[PDB]
Paper text:
Sizzled (Szl) is both a secreted frizzled related protein (sFRP) and a naturally occurring inhibitor of the zinc metalloproteinase bone morphogenetic protein-1 (BMP-1), a key regulator of extracellular matrix assembly and growth factor activation. In most vertebrates (with the exception of mammals) this gradient is finely tuned by the presence of the protein Sizzled (Szl) which is a potent and specific inhibitor of BTPs (Ki = 1.5 nM).
Here we present a new crystal structure for Szl which differs from that previously reported by a large scale (90°) hinge rotation between its cysteine-rich and netrin-like domains. Crystals from native and selenomethionine-labelled Szl belonged to space groups P212121 and P21 and diffracted X-rays to 1.95 and 3.32 Å, respectively. The crystal structure was determined by combining SAD phasing using the Szl-SeMet data with a partial molecular replacement model from the high-resolution native data (1.95 Å) and refinement to the same resolution. The structural fold of Szl is stabilized by eight disulphide bonds (seven intra-domain formed by cysteines 27–90, 37–83, 74–109, 98–136, 102–126, 159–231, 176–281 and one inter-domain formed by cysteines 115–156). In contrast, the NTR domain displays mixed β-α-β topology, consisting of seven β-strands (β3–β9), flanked by helices α5–α8. Instead, there was a rotation about the long axis of one domain with respect to the other of approximately 90°, pivoting around the inter-domain disulphide bridge.
Residue numbers in the entry: 24 to 140, 151 to 187, 201 to 281
The structure:
């Protein structure tokens, strides 16, 4: 038996994707909502990393499929595109792309399947949290990297030192995505109490890479001096 049931608000994967009802069993083989919801919740961290714009579409088509008796599967090429961008993020959390989503289970081509007609943080080594630095070294970091920001983590409102093309909202989100991906690094940084850092990095093509992190301590002089002189500094 197959039934059409409303997507409950507690299913964060799919509670705001445009349609409101789903098929049981779903394409994952879950038979009831007590199974669907916690299994879907395993993906909540991943979906917040922004690793692929179609990640949520892809997963909802499997977890909350539309109410036909025919299964409309994602096309293999959609699985491959989402896997290739998001499996590196899973690996950064100690997880792997599940065998239940190996892309060979989905049809090749584009008939009867779901297909497609900003800079991304990557999993990287943790930057040293620098503490005994001179303002000269900070300024050289500002010259080299194409952005630098002052942020407070606990992650409050961000002050640009070297802004470039960056928009404030986008930069905030890029930082939070970097912290969510790089869980091991976040844990060293967000050692409560709330802490202030200067973060210098590079938005290459088209990835974000954090290269330098400077701890802004209570009675700092060197980051103060560096941020004051940056405006008039010559590289």
């Amino acid at each position: 038996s197959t039934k059409c049931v409303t997507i409950p608000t507690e299913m964060a994967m799919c509670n705001d994707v445009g349609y409101s009802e789903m098929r049981l069993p779903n394409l994952m083989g879950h038979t009831n909502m007590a199974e669907v919801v916690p299994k879907s919740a395993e993906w909540q961290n991943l979906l917040q990393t922004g690793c692929h714009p179609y990640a949520r579409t892809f997963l909802c088509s499997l977890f909350a499929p539309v109410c036909l008796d025919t299964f409309i599967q994602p096309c293999r090429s959609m699985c491959v595109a989402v896997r290739d961008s998001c499996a590196p993020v899973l690996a950064c959390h100690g997880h792997s792309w599940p065998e239940s989503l190996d892309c060979d289970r989905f049809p090749a081509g584009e008939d009867m399947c779901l297909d497609t007609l900003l800079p991304k943080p990557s999993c990287q080594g943790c930057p040293l949290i620098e503490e005994f630095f001179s303002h000269k070294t900070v300024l050289e970091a500002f010259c080299d990297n194409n952005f630098a920001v002052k942020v407070k983590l606990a992650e409050g409102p961000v002050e640009f030192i070297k802004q470039g093309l960056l928009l404030p909202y986008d930069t905030r989100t890029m930082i939070e995505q970097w912290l969510l991906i790089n869980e091991n690094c976040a844990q060293k940084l967000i050692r409560t109490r709330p802490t202030v850092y200067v973060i210098a990095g590079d938005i290459h093509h088209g990835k974000v890479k954090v290269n330098r992190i400077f701890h802004w301590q209570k009675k700092d002089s060197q980051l103060t001096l560096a941020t004051r002189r940056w405006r008039h500094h010559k590289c």
